[PDB]
Enzyme design. Structure first.
Site, short mmCIF file in Angstrom:
data_model
loop_
_atom_site.label_atom_id
_atom_site.label_comp_id
_atom_site.label_asym_id
_atom_site.label_seq_id
_atom_site.Cartn_x
_atom_site.Cartn_y
_atom_site.Cartn_z
N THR A 1 2.52 2.46 3.07
CA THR A 1 2.91 1.30 3.93
C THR A 1 2.87 0.00 3.14
O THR A 1 1.94 -0.22 2.37
CB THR A 1 1.86 1.20 5.08
OG1 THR A 1 1.96 2.37 5.88
CG2 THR A 1 2.07 -0.06 5.90
N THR A 2 3.84 -0.89 3.36
CA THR A 2 3.76 -2.25 2.85
C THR A 2 3.94 -3.18 4.02
O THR A 2 4.85 -3.00 4.85
CB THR A 2 4.94 -2.43 1.84
OG1 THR A 2 4.68 -1.56 0.72
CG2 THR A 2 5.02 -3.81 1.28
N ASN B 1 0.86 -1.17 0.00
CA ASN B 1 0.00 0.00 0.00
C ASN B 1 0.90 1.22 0.00
O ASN B 1 0.69 2.17 0.74
CB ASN B 1 -0.89 -0.04 1.24
CG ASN B 1 -2.01 0.96 1.19
OD1 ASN B 1 -2.79 0.99 0.22
ND2 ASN B 1 -2.16 1.73 2.27
N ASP C 1 5.14 5.98 5.38
CA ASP C 1 4.94 4.52 5.34
C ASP C 1 5.12 3.96 6.74
O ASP C 1 5.97 4.44 7.50
CB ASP C 1 6.01 3.91 4.44
CG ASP C 1 5.78 4.22 2.96
OD1 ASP C 1 4.64 4.07 2.43
OD2 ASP C 1 6.74 4.66 2.30
N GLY C 2 4.39 2.90 7.05
CA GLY C 2 4.72 2.15 8.27
C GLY C 2 5.20 0.75 7.96
O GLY C 2 4.59 -0.24 8.37
#
Ligand SMILES: [Cl-]
Ligand SMILES: [Cl-]
Ligand SMILES: [Cl-]
Ligand SMILES: [Cl-]
Ligand SMILES: [Cl-]
Lengths: 323, 339
Positions: free
Chosen positions: A235-236, A194, A274-275
């Site tokens: 985020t991925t 994502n 991003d997380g």
């Protein structure tokens, strides 16, 4: 040069979980990857009302885990160094509840059952407020079977999206997996991208994210960023599962190596927005040799080598999610 | 009445009577029609900190519970998580902090809180952010009941401003201390304490389930490691040293909430300072068998002065000073949990 999948503008204020009698659906995606990895099962479930979902990796025997969690927006639960399941889900922090449903289904299936969960924010990619809940996590576990993974818009990947310099150019991704076996060694990669960045293939082509409908062409975000500065100033979530025995230190370094390697396929990556979270899991079945030599080099059979191989498996998974 | 030099010169009257947990494969949540109970504990602390509310609920069937701190404005948070042995969120900004029993299963209570907050908001950051932490309280009772979504929702619904139930209440229902041997482990409780100094407000909340014991400012062990053969509690180090001479021959979850503005860097260091200070009141602490976790929260209401001077010294008014004061509030909360 794949056809566009523009997410389009969200409408917020949409109906949430309380507005529906939500029925879990077993996710089948666009196609099934089949793989041979005894002791590892995958289930995926979604609510069409979202659309949003959860994907669960179940290792009934339990497996040593390292977590590599990077960037400014990580939403994580559990985070144990030993897990019976990993749960990935949409719904932002609300979707962590799916992992409680998995923990429940693990008890019913039956000393502590340990589940670690991570989530993506997928609300801008749809026009409802539905999130993966305890019932959906339970369903995902119940749907889990050995040796299958549904590619594309399935489970946590239902409403995943990439390329967020401007939402007018953001495209739906999906979830992706890839599997390789080398002798007795097995490596499974699962990913739900994502990202703020875009998905890039090994030739350097941007293949998903940042698609401009006015031109019909995707751009690497850096070209937008550099022109933006020139004008204005003044985020991925993922898992890698293998069967090779690694110490806690080796497993943690392996996780960091594989996770960094994902900046090849997702650009930019590990950004403040991003997380990104990677679980590295081993079933501890196969020993690496005591010395690292082979005909291919004095230092060719070791955990760094395994990391490099697993990094390729993960890039293939990322490309499956973007396909 | 006496010149004031040591902390002991200035207390909380801890009950010397034992409360041994006793020896522990029992029924889980669906075996029961579980009704949350509002936890009132042994007494209610009243405090004045607008914007901060605490609720506590339990299931008598465990007994186990959850305690929720609700800060509806949202507040910047640092997490200091310090050991071996279950966290959810750990966000740097939270609308609520949920502390619960049930080991990792009790992280579900935080989802109950998150879901209730989402429902009150009728998903843009309009995201409601809840961080949760848990203790393993299953050895101290004979069921497998854990705090679930309904219990977290109930703790949030029972939250009132300016009150906290001391003792066996919420997450503290089946907390326990002193685990060199389970025959000497005692039930603790949860505890809170509050100080207002000038405009500054500091609230400490703690649920001690330590491998170690609770120790007062004079150095007396007051809860945990009670030997029923001798009728007294001694420091675990005496057991450990005797054990080594013989055999090798020749979790605490807590929050500290203040109204003083601190940068992310100042807040994170404040968290580490206060959390380490808890090895005064809990010994040993930060062990491999503990998963100690402290949340440091600021509501960002008031600034410290630009310079740190006062009549009591050049370096007397700063976040380090605030951390030393907050450390004493926390030791008081630990002692309330062990009382
Ligand atoms: Cl997004
Ligand atoms: Cl490629
Ligand atoms: Cl315990
Ligand atoms: Cl419920
Ligand atoms: Cl004292």
């Amino acid at each position: 040069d794949p056809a566009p999948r523009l997410a389009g503008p969200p409408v917020f204020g949409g109906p949430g979980n309380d507005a529906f009698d939500l029925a879990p659906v077993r996710s089948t995606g666009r196609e099934m990857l089949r793989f041979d990895f005894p002791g590892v099962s995958i289930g995926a479930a979604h609510y069409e009302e979202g659309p949003t979902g959860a994907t669960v990796i179940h290792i009934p025997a339990g497996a040593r885990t390292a977590v590599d969690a990077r960037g400014g927006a990580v939403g994580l639960s559990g985070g144990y160094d030993f897990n019976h399941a990993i749960c990935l889900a949409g719904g932002a922090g609300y979707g962590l509840e799916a992992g409680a449903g998995v923990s429940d289904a693990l008890l019913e299936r039956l000393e502590l059952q340990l589940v670690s969960s991570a989530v993506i924010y997928d609300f801008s990619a749809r026009s409802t407020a539905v999130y993966p809940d305890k019932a959906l996590g339970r369903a995902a576990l119940e749907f889990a079977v050995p040796g299958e993974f549904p590619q594309g818009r399935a489970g946590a990947g239902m409403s995943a999206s990439a390329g967020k310099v401007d939402w007018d150019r953001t495209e739906i991704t999906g979830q992706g997996a890839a599997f390789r076996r080398l002798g007795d060694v097995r490596i499974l990669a699962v990913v739900v991208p994502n990202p703020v960045g875009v998905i890039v293939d090994r030739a350097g082509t941007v293949v998903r994210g940042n698609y401009d409908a006015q031109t019909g062409v995707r751009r690497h975000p850096v070209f937008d960023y550099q022109e933006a500065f020139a004008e204005q100033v003044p985020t991925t979530i993922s898992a890698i599962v293998t069967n090779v025995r690694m110490s806690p230190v080796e497993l943690n370094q392996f996780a960091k190596q594989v996770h960094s390697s994902m900046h090849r396929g997702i650009q930019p990556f590990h950004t403040d927005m991003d997380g990104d979270t990677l679980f590295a899991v081993t079933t501890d079945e196969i020993d690496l040799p005591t010395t690292p030599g082979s005909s291919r080099g004095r230092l060719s059979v070791n955990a760094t080598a395994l990391g490099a191989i697993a990094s390729e498996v993960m890039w293939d998974a990322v490309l499956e999610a973007g396909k």
